[PDB]
Symmetry: C12
Subunit: 107 residues, 12 copies
């Protein structure tokens, strides 16, 4: 559990990303909303980094490449980036949950 | 702590208001006036949440949210993103405070 | 502080009235006369709600709602936004007093 | 108490069920002129009968919330659906009110046991 | 229960009206069947009156206005009139049933 | 009483016959001959019911039902109304006699 | 008086035969030859039913049914009416003897 | 008794199941001439085999109820569906008959206990 | 049970026929597959005969007429022939099963 | 006996292979090469089954199955028939060996 | 003789890989590059399976499978056949060792 | 043992869940060029991270089974779906393997009781 330094924060950022991801698959987006959405992706990765152990900051950094800060990504590109985050986070927490369940069994 | 939400009832109330409005925007297309009104609601509702959260969460929410351009009317898409961001963030916030409360129930189950 | 809702029965019935109207607006398109009627109902029902709430929640509601422009007839969308705002805000209010009350039931249990 | 807010519960409940059934009927299919007049008049008389069965405070609350129809014009399907939908919701709330009352008596009258 | 003098009769007239109402919503009607149907509405209100206490005869009378006996009403008008009766009757009997249930609890 | 149906088996039998025929008319459109036949069935079936009911119900049913014009063929709609009237009236009649029978079962539950 | 149905097995199987044919007529349109065939079956099956019933129910059935005009071939509709009449009348007959018999089971219980 | 009305129950049941399955097959899709002839002949032989397995009274009842097909013409999908549907219903009733019989023995043979 | 001399064999031939019957109702067939299918019907009746008592060999023979060995039958004709077999077999086994169940009750 | 399947695991394995392939042919239309391959699979798979069955079943299966023409490519229909024949025959074969096994379980239930 | 599958974990994961790919081919049409890729995967995965099986089952598999013609790119259909062959053969293999193992569980019970 | 085939189970599981979610996303809707490049690169880096968390034998098995993408061309929706589908299936099998392992320990550690 020592991999996730602030579990509450990482959980809520993840829930935000998953909810936004549900929205992009809801309908096509226009220029401005995809602008907001690249920006939100940037800031939300920063917040996640704050809440993770160093090796995971660096793992996530190896797996994710940022968006062109001057260019507007497509619905597809946004959907890939956010789907990656959501999947990585859910795997992270099935990890900490098989751990917690292991402790439940130890006691 | 659960002490991060200084006024939990208020934050729950703003949150369900926003979730209900998001469901309405996903219900049918909107016109000029209703989009403008909905922008204004988004602004004041982030202000109320700020009132109801600990400083760390005021400044986190502030880092994650960008206000709308006050001279232009946002699109249906832009509004859905803004409010969806809020809704997801809040639902995560309360799965947090609920992991805390449930931990307390199990501690008191425990010492017996 | 369940003392935030001073007249719970009244607030509940106004809430059910507004919710039922919202379902009607989403049911079918409206004409001028019915949209004016519903505008008027929105105004008076906000006033009844104010009557039934503690001052701080009256003032919160006031910060959250802008009345309608009486120089125009609002669109179905604008009405749907206003009433949806009310409905969600009310349901959140009662999930609050409900988690509180159930907590008291546990205190007594 | 709160049950003394509704002076004649049997009457209020049956008027309410009448209005609910007609609301469902109006949403069932479009209406003609004659049906819209009958339905407006039913709306009027049913508000009067409902008034008869409520406490003064709810008589005047309902009055503050309801506006009569224009009698020189025949209202549209839209106005009628609004009028009756308002009634249905207001009554539904009224009875979750008295319903929380009766349940409250049930809880007191086991609490003493 | 003193409001409904002959409960069996009122129940069967009501079941007749409700069944006819289901039929009008089943398909559009022609002239002759709408003629029969206004007439049945008239006679069935008479029969109901026979089975109700005076104040309810008068209440129902205040709420219902008869059809033009020389003119043929539309499917819509018939459907309104009969829906009114059905709703009023069902409310009447949820009344007598909350009463009977109250007696069940008293004993 | 339950003594209002002098021959209960017979009335149940005419009733299910009529209900089955109503279901057939709602099944598909009819032609000249089948509408005529169905008119005749309606007539004789009201006569059989009269045989099986107490006088008060003979005369009530008579007040509620109008016979068909014997020289003209009724429409599909007119037939559905006539038979639907009968079916609803009968179903109400037997929820009556069943409220009686059930009352009897509870009385005998009771004195024990 | 379960003695109204003198041969219950026979009446039951004729009843199931007629019901199954009714389902076939509602299944698809028919031609002349099959509609004549079904007309003939209707006649003979009414005669077998008569054989299996008490006199008063034979005479009731007779009052309720008019035979087919043999100078024409009936339409699918006319056949459907006649057989539906039989089926409903039979099902009512057996809900009668069934409420009676179950009542006897209770008398013995 | 009533079970002695069906002299060979195994045979009657299997002929019956055969006819039921073909009825379902005919309603499955339209048929050609050759299939209609095979199916008419199956109808004939199956009535004869069925006769072999029933009491005389039911042999003659079935005969009063069934007419053979016209052998100089090939019957239509319609006539065949009628013929086999008649058989299926008649047999279904026959076995609710013997079924009420067996259940009757079950009730006697607990009644004495 | 003395009517079915080799129950395992008759059961598997029957399962084969039923499975093939499901296939013909699956899609229309071409010339060659209907050729194979008449032939399979012939040989499968032979195999069934091997597994049945004489009176049933003769009963089945009375009820079934073979295909023209030089002509190709239609999807419909094949479907009739195989549906007959399937139905006859299922009836045969509801027979032997009501028998076996009867023995279960005897003991 | 259950001793008619000399190698039961092998026959089950060939059988599920064939059933899976039948499901694929019913999934979508096939081209030249895939039909040819599937013909070859049918041939070798009957050979493997022969290896795994008692002589009586080798010769029965041989009486019931006709090989494909080795110079021509069978149609989608012809392949579905061939494999459906196999699948049905095998499923019947194992409801047989299962009626045997279940009989054994009941015998051992029995002598106790 | 559970000793027929020498490395059960490896055979199981290769099996799940192939099954998942089969679902992908049935999901949508493919282009040249992806059909060549899947051809290559089919070859190497047969080799890994061989590594994990007893000799007689290697040789059985070899009798049952013909490799792909590398002079052409196979069609979606041909790939679907080859992989379906593998999947069915594998599922049958494991229903075998599973009925055996469950039988042992009963021997010990 | 078999659980020692996966040296870092937490890491391998989360990389696997990441790849599964992206596979579902690609099948959700068609992709553009930029998305296909991001997705190819994600495929590369995720294979490297996955390697880090497996035993050498599975590192080299996975390598025998996977071919990198052509870096001078951008792969199609088809190639990407194949590549990631292969990964997903291979990992799913890997974990039913270690899953049968853990369950095996559960059975030994009641067997001695």
């Amino acid at each position: 559990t020592d991999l996730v330094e602030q579990p509450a924060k990482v959980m809520r950022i993840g829930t935000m990303i998953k909810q936004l991801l549900e929205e992009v698959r809801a309908a096509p987006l226009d220029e401005a909303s995809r602008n907001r959405l690249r920006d939100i992706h940037a800031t939300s990765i920063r917040e996640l980094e704050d809440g993770l152990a160093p090796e995971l900051r660096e793992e996530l950094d190896r797996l994710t490449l940022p968006f062109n800060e001057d260019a507007v990504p497509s619905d597809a590109e946004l959907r890939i980036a956010q789907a990656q985050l959501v999947g990585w986070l859910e795997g992270l927490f099935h990890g900490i949950q098989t751990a917690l369940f292991a402790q439940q069994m130890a006691a």
